Design an enzyme around this catalytic site. Structure first.
Site, mmCIF file in Angstrom:
data_model
loop_
_atom_site.group_PDB
_atom_site.id
_atom_site.type_symbol
_atom_site.label_atom_id
_atom_site.label_comp_id
_atom_site.label_asym_id
_atom_site.label_seq_id
_atom_site.Cartn_x
_atom_site.Cartn_y
_atom_site.Cartn_z
ATOM 1 C CG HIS A 237 26.229 41.248 39.976
ATOM 2 N ND1 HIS A 237 27.399 41.245 39.652
ATOM 3 C CD2 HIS A 237 25.917 42.237 41.129
ATOM 4 C CE1 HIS A 237 28.030 41.848 40.387
ATOM 5 N NE2 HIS A 237 27.353 42.426 41.537
ATOM 6 C CG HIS B 284 28.165 45.284 43.953
ATOM 7 N ND1 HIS B 284 28.451 44.806 42.834
ATOM 8 C CD2 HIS B 284 28.519 46.700 43.754
ATOM 9 C CE1 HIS B 284 29.151 45.655 42.233
ATOM 10 N NE2 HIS B 284 29.143 46.974 42.601
ATOM 11 C CB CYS C 150 56.181 29.507 50.659
ATOM 12 S SG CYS C 150 55.371 29.557 49.115
HETATM 13 C C1 LIG Z 1 56.896 30.049 48.155
HETATM 14 O O1 LIG Z 1 57.679 29.865 48.482
HETATM 15 C C2 LIG Z 1 56.324 30.285 46.684
HETATM 16 C C3 LIG Z 1 56.270 31.800 46.583
HETATM 17 C C4 LIG Z 1 56.540 32.285 44.984
HETATM 18 C C5 LIG Z 1 56.184 33.546 44.650
HETATM 19 C C6 LIG Z 1 56.062 33.780 43.217
HETATM 20 C C7 LIG Z 1 56.015 35.181 42.699
HETATM 21 C C1 LIG Z 2 28.126 38.111 42.448
HETATM 22 O O1 LIG Z 2 26.935 38.539 42.161
HETATM 23 C C2 LIG Z 2 29.160 38.039 41.337
HETATM 24 C C3 LIG Z 2 29.193 36.483 40.732
HETATM 25 C C4 LIG Z 2 30.069 36.598 39.826
HETATM 26 C C5 LIG Z 2 29.969 35.145 39.042
HETATM 27 C C6 LIG Z 2 30.864 35.077 37.890
HETATM 28 C C7 LIG Z 2 30.691 33.539 37.074
#
Ligand SMILES: *C(=O)CCCCCC
Ligand SMILES: *C(=O)CCCCCC
Lengths: 127, 141
Positions: free
Chosen positions: B18, B30, B119
């Site tokens: 990390h 971070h 969309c």
């Molecule tokens: C695009 O038109 C799809 C959007 C979907 C939203 C789902 C909550």
């Molecule tokens: C950044 O240091 C965080 C990265 C997270 C990895 C999770 C698999």
């Protein structure tokens, strides 16, 4: 009833809580960006590098009748006043190509390291 | 042996490393994992309600957020080291500049808005070839 859409037509589906968009590509089918939510922990190689993949959407090709379900929809090419639509055969060709494409984020330790290196140095490394 | 402002910190968590950057007085900045789905309510019709139906724009998928926290908390029980890995390749920015830029990013989120609007941009791009800014996760300003 109401005439079938034409190839290239934008379709606005009125679901109960939100509006869902699609594009008609012929013979009953639309292409649309559909929700597809998956979070997965993975082990990349090169000691393994743990990662988190978040997928949220995927472009699908499905029948209009299945996408609309019981919800009403309309053709709504509402930007035809200000933009040229492309030729209709080109629109559908380009729509078919995107099918299967995913919206996703891959989070590993690399992302965090590139992030802090950018602050310390002003430089986006490409390894 | 305390870090200096601008130092990169590598924290050895059990399954991954990390990273953080030291900004002074016990604190690091971070990029922290913060994975969330949240529904997002339709506001356009907010001041002109005629149904009591709650309406949605979509769903937000958030993956990370830039935080400012104490090193001691971020490290927890994991060990860490200073690791300014590329000081041999090019020199760091001036240290006040590093911390200024780090503080500004705090609160920025890595996310994707799966909304009606998004969309509509997608299908508009197919019908008109009008390019889009939003097809992928973004980092907010
Ligand atoms: C695009 O038109 C799809 C959007 C979907 C939203 C789902 C909550
Ligand atoms: C950044 O240091 C965080 C990265 C997270 C990895 C999770 C698999």
């Amino acid at each position: 009833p109401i005439p079938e859409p034409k190839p290239g037509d934008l379709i606005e589906i009125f679901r109960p809580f939100y509006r869902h968009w699609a594009i008609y590509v012929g013979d009953g089918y639309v292409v649309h960006l559909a929700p597809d939510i998956l979070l997965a922990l993975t082990n990349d190689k090169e000691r393994l590098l743990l990662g988190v993949i978040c997928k949220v959407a995927i472009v699908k090709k499905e029948l209009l009748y299945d996408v609309a379900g019981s919800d009403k929809y309309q053709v709504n090419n509402k930007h035809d006043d200000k933009y040229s639509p492309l030729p209709c055969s080109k629109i559908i060709q380009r729509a078919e190509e995107l099918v299967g494409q995913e919206v996703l984020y891959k989070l590993t330790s690399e992302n965090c390291e590139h992030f802090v290196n950018e602050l310390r140095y002003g430089v986006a490394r490409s390894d």
